[PDB]
Amino acid sequence: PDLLV
Amino acid sequence: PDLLV
Amino acid sequence: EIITVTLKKQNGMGLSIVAAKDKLGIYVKSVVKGGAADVDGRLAAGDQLLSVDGRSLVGLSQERAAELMTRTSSVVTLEVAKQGAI
Amino acid sequence: PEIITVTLKKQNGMGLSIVAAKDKLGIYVKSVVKGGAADVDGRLAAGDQLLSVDGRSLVGLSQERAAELMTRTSSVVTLEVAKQGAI
Numbered sequence: 001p002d003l004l005v
Numbered sequence: 006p007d008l009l010v
Numbered sequence: 011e012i013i014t015v016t017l018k019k020q021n022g023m024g025l026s027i028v029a030a031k032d033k034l035g036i037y038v039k040s041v042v043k044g045g046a047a048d049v050d051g052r053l054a055a056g057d058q059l060l061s062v063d064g065r066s067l068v069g070l071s072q073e074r075a076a077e078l079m080t081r082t083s084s085v086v087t088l089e090v091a092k093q094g095a096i
Numbered sequence: 097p098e099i100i101t102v103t104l105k106k107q108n109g110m111g112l113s114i115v116a117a118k119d120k121l122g123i124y125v126k127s128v129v130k131g132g133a134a135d136v137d138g139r140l141a142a143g144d145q146l147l148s149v150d151g152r153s154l155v156g157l158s159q160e161r162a163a164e165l166m167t168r169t170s171s172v173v174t175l176e177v178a179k180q181g182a183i
Contacts, residue, residue, distance in 0.1 A: 001115075001159065002113050002114065002115050002126050002127075002159070003113070003114050003159050003160065003162075003163045004044055004107065004109065004112070004113055004114075004129070005109055005110055005112045005113075005114050005162075005163050005166045005167060007026040007039065007040065007130070007131070008026065008027050008028070008039075008072050008073070008076055009022065009024075009025065009026055009027075009042070009130065009131040010022065010023050010025045010027055010075075010076055010079040010080060011178060011179055011183075012147070012176065012177065012178055012179075013139065013176075013177050013179065014174065014175070014176055014177070015137065015139050015140060015174075015175045015177055016172060016173070016174045016175070017110045017133045017134060017137060017172070017173055017175065018133060018171055018172050019108050019109050019110055019133060019169075019171050019172075019173070020108065020109070020110075020111065020132060020133045020136075021106040021107075021108050022106050022107055022131070022132070023104050023106055024107065042130075044113070045107060046104045046105065046106055046107045047104060050102065050104055052100065052102050053102060058097075060099070084105055084106055084108060085103060085104070085105045085106070086103070086104055086106065087101065087102075087103045088101070088102045088103070088104065089099065089101055090099065090100050090101070090102050091097045091098075091099050092097050092098040092099070092100060093097055094097060096097060
């Protein structure tokens, strides 16, 4: 699980 | 390389 | 070890483009994983980008197309020919 | 060929893929997005720990909470970074 910022 | 838009 | 980095945010559709040939055409070389075009799911490698916000992308270089596709607002409208090689 | 009209809202940001890991949680750079603001700046790299955003600590919080704080920001954001935070 990863996010883009 | 790449040309990114 | 501990540095201070200040960043100015930037825009992008998440598309790698190439120009190819009676006139030039702008094609999707690659769709960037996780980018706006990838999350939208409609664009794919091989598609031709016919225009940006009503302005034609035919008969111009990669760099000129990039200049036009980056000088726009947060939301951009593309006309696309699915698998542009006819 | 099939001719369709695709409208996209560009992803506006720093160009950083983040992950939360542990002891308190910590926010780490999983990947630096090619061509993004962090890549053009050249200082950030995968494995670095983002210690804070504009004076607000990024320690002890989830990926989503860090993303809420890092996107809430104005066009220009200031990060405190621990180079290769896996120390």
